[PDB]
Design an enzyme around this catalytic site. Structure first.
Site, PDB file in Angstrom:
ATOM      1  N   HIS B   9     104.504   0.899  67.327  1.00  0.00           N
ATOM      2  CA  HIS B   9     104.422   2.358  67.325  1.00  0.00           C
ATOM      3  C   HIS B   9     105.796   3.015  67.100  1.00  0.00           C
ATOM      4  O   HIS B   9     105.924   3.909  66.246  1.00  0.00           O
ATOM      5  CB  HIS B   9     103.608   2.847  68.532  1.00  0.00           C
ATOM      6  CG  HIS B   9     103.351   4.324  68.572  1.00  0.00           C
ATOM      7  ND1 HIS B   9     102.967   5.055  67.460  1.00  0.00           N
ATOM      8  CD2 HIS B   9     103.416   5.223  69.579  1.00  0.00           C
ATOM      9  CE1 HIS B   9     102.804   6.326  67.776  1.00  0.00           C
ATOM     10  NE2 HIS B   9     103.090   6.453  69.059  1.00  0.00           N
ATOM     11  N   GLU B  45     114.227   2.391  63.587  1.00  0.00           N
ATOM     12  CA  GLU B  45     114.366   1.589  62.388  1.00  0.00           C
ATOM     13  C   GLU B  45     114.434   0.112  62.782  1.00  0.00           C
ATOM     14  O   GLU B  45     114.828  -0.227  63.893  1.00  0.00           O
ATOM     15  CB  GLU B  45     115.594   2.108  61.673  1.00  0.00           C
ATOM     16  CG  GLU B  45     115.309   2.590  60.278  1.00  0.00           C
ATOM     17  CD  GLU B  45     116.635   2.972  59.641  1.00  0.00           C
ATOM     18  OE1 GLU B  45     117.600   3.193  60.431  1.00  0.00           O
ATOM     19  OE2 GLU B  45     116.725   2.979  58.378  1.00  0.00           O
ATOM     20  N   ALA B  71      95.271  -0.481  71.234  1.00  0.00           N
ATOM     21  CA  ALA B  71      94.000  -0.077  70.665  1.00  0.00           C
ATOM     22  C   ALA B  71      94.233   0.472  69.254  1.00  0.00           C
ATOM     23  O   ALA B  71      95.372   0.619  68.814  1.00  0.00           O
ATOM     24  CB  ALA B  71      93.277   0.864  71.615  1.00  0.00           C
ATOM     25  N   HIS B  72      93.158   0.755  68.527  1.00  0.00           N
ATOM     26  CA  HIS B  72      93.273   1.515  67.298  1.00  0.00           C
ATOM     27  C   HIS B  72      93.677   2.941  67.633  1.00  0.00           C
ATOM     28  O   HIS B  72      93.389   3.432  68.703  1.00  0.00           O
ATOM     29  CB  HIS B  72      91.934   1.458  66.566  1.00  0.00           C
ATOM     30  CG  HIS B  72      91.763   0.240  65.720  1.00  0.00           C
ATOM     31  ND1 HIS B  72      92.572   0.044  64.553  1.00  0.00           N
ATOM     32  CD2 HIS B  72      90.903  -0.813  65.812  1.00  0.00           C
ATOM     33  CE1 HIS B  72      92.189  -1.072  63.953  1.00  0.00           C
ATOM     34  NE2 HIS B  72      91.164  -1.622  64.727  1.00  0.00           N
ATOM     35  N   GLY B  73      94.381   3.575  66.717  1.00  0.00           N
ATOM     36  CA  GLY B  73      94.702   4.983  66.713  1.00  0.00           C
ATOM     37  C   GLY B  73      94.990   5.360  65.256  1.00  0.00           C
ATOM     38  O   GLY B  73      94.765   4.556  64.342  1.00  0.00           O
ATOM     39  N   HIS B  75      97.545   5.580  63.434  1.00  0.00           N
ATOM     40  CA  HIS B  75      98.446   4.750  62.652  1.00  0.00           C
ATOM     41  C   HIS B  75      97.735   3.513  62.108  1.00  0.00           C
ATOM     42  O   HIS B  75      97.952   3.152  60.960  1.00  0.00           O
ATOM     43  CB  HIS B  75      99.688   4.376  63.459  1.00  0.00           C
ATOM     44  CG  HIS B  75     100.422   5.565  63.960  1.00  0.00           C
ATOM     45  ND1 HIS B  75     101.024   6.459  63.102  1.00  0.00           N
ATOM     46  CD2 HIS B  75     100.612   6.034  65.214  1.00  0.00           C
ATOM     47  CE1 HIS B  75     101.589   7.418  63.814  1.00  0.00           C
ATOM     48  NE2 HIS B  75     101.343   7.185  65.113  1.00  0.00           N
TER      49      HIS B  75
END
Lengths: 125, 124
Positions: B9, B45, B71-73, B75
């Site tokens: 993330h 970065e 989890a999925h989100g 992004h």
């Protein structure tokens, strides 16, 4: 009785709550804790204040709060320990009675079992 | 040649990158992949485009991208697959025609996660 409250980030999408719900089922089946509740920092219900208060209402005197996050961030070092009354400073609001103790635990980190899951996922499994 | 790219993330705090760095050393020590790189979705970065590009440069024709997210989100369902060229849309990752990107699934409600959660509850 002791309670476990699992605490997650929360999302605009429903996957984050869905993840927390499934995890809570799985830990309930290990029979370690009479009370297992989930809270989300943001976006959806139940909120972390809601989950704590729901475990107090079931008569929990010792609540373990486990942040289900991979790394520390703003939620794990500030937003969450503030709500739980562990460090100072229209929100939610959580009063903690005098005979209730909150034990705030550590996040997942770079645990060896996460590298196991990473390797499984690399092979599409 | 098979590169594994671990994708995270990112945050305004530095712990998220630190986690990705540590995990990349740990998967290096399993000796399953000749090339292992990390990318952060936001803030930090290297970027995901930077990591994929730096794997191509070392000559990998098969790049596995594994989302290190619980989890999925947004992004994992939109931003990452767009970037990699696997879905349509409407700083730039090229991707040569002789290289294949395999985008994998996030961590999810794995039994190993519940084991870690139980450890953490008892303060190990």
């Amino acid at each position: 009785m002791e309670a476990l409250v699992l605490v997650g980030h929360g999302s605009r999408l429903p996957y984050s709550k869905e993840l927390l719900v499934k995890l809570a089922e799985k830990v309930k089946e290990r029979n370690l804790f009479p009370i297992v509740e989930i809270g989300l920092m943001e976006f959806s219900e139940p909120t972390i204040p809601q989950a704590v208060k729901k475990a107090i209402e079931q008569g929990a005197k010792r609540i373990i709060v486990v942040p289900v996050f991979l790394a520390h961030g703003i939620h794990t070092t500030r937003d969450i320990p503030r709500l739980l009354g562990l460090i100072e400073d229209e929100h939610e609001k959580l009063e903690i009675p005098e005979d209730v103790e909150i034990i705030y635990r550590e996040p997942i980190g770079a645990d060896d079992r996460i590298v196991d899951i990473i390797i499984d996922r690399a092979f599409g499994r």
